[PDB]
């Protein structure tokens, strides 16, 4: 908290910069050391840095990720908290703000000068608060300290009238009464940097790597780890990513987008049973998703009652899901291909009559349509329950206990719903 | 009751199956593949 320690610290930083330039200078003649010691050593360094502030800006939301020929305005603004619960973004950063810098790449010395934690806090944070040790170390008289303080504060203030380019995005919003708000969004570099840091410690962090190795050793680690599949990488600067932002050099481009995909984002094609072995193998016709899902049905054998309430809820929604994708598979076959009535034979397990709904009525007028509308073939629920009965283990204690009774009553409810949706196919 | 049985001269790994009371052919390999399978799956069922 003494100005002398701050003064010798900033002079140490200046002379460190000077010895760095003379070390990476490789000079033997031309007397550039004289100009380097006249400009990059004295208190003139503070003067040209206070000149070089106005090219830089501390920001949290910049424009340059949107099309980089966009000379608009960038904002260091932290939004207020939503009163509505649930949703959130970039207002969660209270002390973990990283404060991206835009501007010229030549004048980064102002930012690495101002970013120092000399006493216990930031130099901009000590210079914004009017105090005793501030406004005195970078001075000999008061008025140059005044103009250098008003120089060094303005890196967090916007420059010019507020503006967003034609290349920037501007999107109307319908207000409840009438009229619109024009809503130009900006790229949150601080929020993206925080999620990028979180994903980096989640994938390449050593605490995650250790649990990833302990999973392979099959031993018990104290904590766990995550994987984050289906990330997409989006780069902003093409071959010069430094021209976008400061934090775009830590992550060299690399937006690291999270997947928001519908579950049918892997296109699964259709396959109807033709032969006898095809009728054997394609009656159930089961995708990898239902095997992944019934693997979790097999992992619900043990139960303690206070946990078994939530476990039975999970089994209820799980058997609802297996009914959902069974009806989904039947619907996509029944609308996609005419392959259920492609070629005849003797073996197609023809008692189903759900995978060939337009294959029996849109072609045969009274032959199969009146043989299906009056019969109403919906009997697939009990055969599906016989197939689903394999999912629990065939343990004598599992059948002797009441867990088999709870299993059968929830299975009966869900096959009842499958019955109720399967019956109404003639409307 | 051991989960894997290496048939040593013939370079075959037999894994125990519980349905029938016997071992069935799992893969080829010797002591190294046996020890690696023991490390992955755990022995003694």
């Amino acid at each position: 908290p003494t100005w002398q320690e701050l003064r010798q610290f900033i002079e140490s930083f200046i002379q460190e910069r000077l010895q760095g330039k003379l070390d990476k200078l490789q000079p033997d003649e031309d007397d550039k050391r004289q100009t380097l010691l006249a400009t990059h050593r004295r208190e003139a360094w503070l003067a040209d840095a206070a000149r070089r502030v106005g090219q830089l800006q501390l920001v949290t939301h910049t424009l340059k990720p949107i099309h980089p020929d966009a000379r608009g305005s960038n904002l260091h603004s932290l939004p207020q908290a939503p009163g509505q619960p649930g949703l959130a973004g970039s207002h969660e950063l209270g002390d973990r703000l990283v404060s991206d810098v835009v501007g010229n790449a030549a004048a980064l010395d102002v930012f690495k000068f101002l970013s120092l934690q000399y006493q216990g806090k930031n130099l901009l944070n000590w210079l914004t608060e009017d105090s005793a040790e501030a406004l005195q170390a970078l001075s000999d008289n008061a008025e140059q300290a005044r103009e250098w303080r008003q120089a060094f504060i303005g890196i967090t203030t916007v420059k010019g009238a507020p503006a967003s380019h034609s290349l920037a995005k501007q999107l109307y919003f319908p207000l409840p009464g009438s009229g619109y708000h024009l809503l130009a969004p900006l790229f949150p570099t601080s929020l993206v940097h925080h999620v990028h840091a979180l994903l980096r410690e989640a994938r390449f962090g050593d605490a995650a790597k250790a649990a990833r190795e302990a999973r392979s050793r099959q031993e018990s680690w104290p904590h766990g780890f995550s994987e984050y599949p289906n990330l997409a990488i989006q780069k902003f600067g093409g071959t010069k990513p430094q021209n976008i932002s400061q934090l775009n050099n830590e992550r060299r481009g690399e937006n690291w987008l999270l997947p928001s995909l519908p579950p049918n984002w892997q296109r699964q094609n259709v396959n109807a049973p033709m032969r006898h072995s095809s009728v054997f193998e394609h009656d159930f016709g089961r995708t990898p998703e239902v095997s992944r899902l019934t693997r979790t049905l097999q992992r619900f054998l043990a139960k303690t009652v206070h946990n078994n309430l939530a476990i039975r809820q999970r089994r209820a929604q799980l058997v609802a899901q297996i009914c959902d994708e069974a009806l989904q598979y039947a619907a996509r076959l029944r609308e996609l291909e005419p392959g259920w009535s492609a070629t005849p034979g003797c073996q197609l397990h023809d008692a189903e009559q759900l995978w060939l709904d337009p294959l029996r009525a849109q072609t045969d007028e009274t032959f199969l349509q009146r043989r299906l509308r009056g019969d109403w073939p919906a009997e697939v629920g009990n055969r599906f329950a016989n197939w689903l009965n394999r999912a629990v283990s065939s343990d004598s204690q599992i059948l002797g206990s009441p867990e088999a009774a709870q299993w059968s009553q929830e299975l009966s409810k869900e096959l009842t719903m499958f019955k109720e949706i399967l019956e109404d196919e003639r409307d | 009751i051991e989960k894997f049985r290496c048939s040593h001269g013939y370079n075959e790994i037999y894994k125990y199956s519980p349905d029938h009371e016997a071992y069935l052919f799992y893969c080829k390999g010797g002591q190294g593949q046996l020890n690696k399978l023991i490390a992955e799956n755990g022995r003694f069922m």
């Binding site: 000379r71 034609s166 501007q170 990488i233 780069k235 296109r267 | -």
Partner: protein, 335 residues
Amino acid sequence: ILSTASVLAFERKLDPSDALMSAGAWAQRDASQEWPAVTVREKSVRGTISNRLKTKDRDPAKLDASIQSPNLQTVDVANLPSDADTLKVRFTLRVLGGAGTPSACNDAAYRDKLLQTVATYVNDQGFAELARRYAHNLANARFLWRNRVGAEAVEVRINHIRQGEVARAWRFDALAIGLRDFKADAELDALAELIASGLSGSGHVLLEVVAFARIGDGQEVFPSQELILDKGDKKGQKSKTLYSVRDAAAIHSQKIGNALRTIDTWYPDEDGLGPIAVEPYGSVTSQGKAYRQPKQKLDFYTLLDNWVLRDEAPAVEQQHYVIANLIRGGVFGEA
């Protein structure tokens, strides 16, 4: 003073779709709705060095050491089946309409001046020179980009689609209609009036364009090629990836759109090329050289400023080009 609007944006009229390519035999083209799709598959290519050497790799020891190590890829290739000599390329095209109205304009005075200029053009000479050239680029199968240069016979079928069914069907011999002469024909002019009524009206006019080409049994067809940066790190990967929508090779919609916009015969450099695509500072990607430079007064922006702001109406060819840019679309505006 009527300055230029700071946000100008025109939506893309003449919106095509992805040109799906499928394959079958010629002289059963009328039953070509169940033709199997041309699929994109992999093959390994291995080449010697054929590039120019940088005068430090011309030591014959270095050359003989270099050609003992060939360079291996795995390219995507799309071929016709060995018993199918015809490539059927089938896309749809929406001619939207409201060709002069911008999707974004700042100055309402500039917007009304631009609407008055466009309506002055349309009432003066409608979309009849532009839609004739768009009907030509639909008629000759220029959208068959490299699938056209060695074909024995190219036939293009264009069907106007009303609410659920065909309203009017065309059929052209795409090799007789040249790639450089915008001549006159009865069916071409009927298609031109249809695209004119599309671009002038409020609702869209939808066309289904099908093009057949006799290439040969098993010959190579050329779907669109994908621009992927970050091909991969530290492994072996693909050097050439072909576009395919659903296990079925395809041309990108923007490549079909670049073929349809190839109407610009009025650029001041000589027509050794012929027609080029309508672009501001009209820049052919294959040529690498941008014609209609702003050094001359003949790009899109300066012609639009002289036409709208100071009422210096250009020649009828250049305002054909300007309205062709307005049909093309674009995002314009200064800081």
